[PDB]
Amino acid sequence: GSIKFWDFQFATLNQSFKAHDADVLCLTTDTDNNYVFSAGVDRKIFQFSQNTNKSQKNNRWVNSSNRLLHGNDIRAICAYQSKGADFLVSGGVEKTLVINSLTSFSNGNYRKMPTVEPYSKNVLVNKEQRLVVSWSESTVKIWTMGNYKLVCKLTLKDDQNISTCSLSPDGQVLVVGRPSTTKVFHLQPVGNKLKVTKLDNDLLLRTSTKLVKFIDNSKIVICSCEDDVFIVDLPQEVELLEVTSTKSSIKVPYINRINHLEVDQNIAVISRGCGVVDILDLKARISKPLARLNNFITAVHINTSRKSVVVITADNKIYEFNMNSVLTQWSKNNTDNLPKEWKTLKENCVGIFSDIENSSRLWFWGATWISRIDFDVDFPINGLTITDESNFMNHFFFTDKYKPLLFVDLISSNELAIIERNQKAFIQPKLVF
Amino acid sequence: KDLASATNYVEGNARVTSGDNFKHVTGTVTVILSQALQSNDHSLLETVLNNRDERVIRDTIFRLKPALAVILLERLAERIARQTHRQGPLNVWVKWCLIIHGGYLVSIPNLMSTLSSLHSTLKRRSDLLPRLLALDARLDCTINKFKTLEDDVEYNEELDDAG
């Protein structure tokens, strides 16, 4: 639990601080080496300061303060500083990220990230047959709700974890996808239980799959890890527009890769990290550009009834694009006029699903919030993140009662599924008198 | 010791005491009961005290010689005092003694000095009663309120491939 400062040239001890009550696992420092931050087993983060000029002249460090922000081991800590950014990020056995400001660590506010942010959904629900399917660590479990019964569970050989699972609308066909291979299994109900048979298709087995979706009970769309979109009937490749190379793309490759694949009534849309959205006609197998946004896309949805595509950027702005005005009149009126709740959200939206009773109404939810908006009504006009001075590259219902949320979707027109998440700790007594 | 330091409190070998301490101010076992009381045989009497049958208690003390009754009362106080958990059974003995030999006990020059242990002993149990009722009422309400208030479905890919 002791932190020691050593003179490099003479290889000798200069200062010793018995700060922590247990092992000190990791250390980090600011850009100017004015602050030394320690963290470790005792769940405490200690800041050591040499900022004062007299301290600098005398080369003496001072343990200014300490803070208790983690309920368990702080296995890792890192620091970043820039003209617009000041982040002290720590993580460990608590499974959550905690963010602080180096200059204002003692006095500044802090944010505790949710343990699970479902940017990629690990649970799906089938409206027909009322099945809820979750896949974790090469194990798939399926539940039926009339009240819930685990009808079946599937165990897979491959050490590789399951990337995605897609279930056919009928529910008879379940596709399990991994980067190494793709396997499809037919589900058949016998005696309130599902019988599993593995339909054999060589092409999928040798096919890498990031995203997979069902056109119908038979046909699927698969995007390979090399960004190859094709149709398999249970390969019909689909032409894709080329993306111009950018210095940001060179530095970070995956931004030009496909992030969200959504198919709806023979209409497919692809969103890349660079903000490029393209509408794909599966029958024609041709690509037409739709939009080019400046922010990362977090969620996409297609509404056939309104003949529009809903795109959500990282800044929680909502855009409704006409499929061929490029943007719907609602989007032109309401994108910058969103309610206070949407703008105030510090967690980005990740899931969109339609309302059966009214096609105009859409449902939106994040890790800790659920919202519904009607696109037929216009709204009344009336610190711990980058300031974003630089560019990224180069009728209304809101509820926060339910949290944390793994997956949200409807079972029926009037039935909503909300899926929620339900180790020893170093004893730091809280004095009570 | 530092002279600034204050001397601490130590009880040492002092004797504790209480203000109530007034010492310086067929099937019957009667014959055994009279026997042990006369001879102060703790072992013999303890066997007599082991009877839990009320009819035996009455019959035994019914025939006990009235003078021996007084010493019996004194001794029950002592045995109660050492072991309070035996309070329940031994009041019965003190009770039946009191009613049957009550006439004799009236014709005694002094009672409190010779029965001080009982009075002190009996007083202690009474001092408990007001508090226990309070405990019972609190203990009453809570219970009152609270009385009112995978392998079968498993599908293994390896075994399926095997057969």
Partner: peptide, 29 residues
């Protein structure tokens, strides 16, 4: 009779001194 009246009174006096795995709920909109 006065015993039980008094004992009854005592109890009154001392008296006066003194998450599911699955839940079904209906949201409001």
């Amino acid at each position: 009779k006065q015993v039980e009246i008094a004992e009854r009174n005592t109890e009154l006096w001392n008296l006066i001194d003194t998450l599911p795995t699955y839940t079904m709920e209906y949201l409001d909109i």
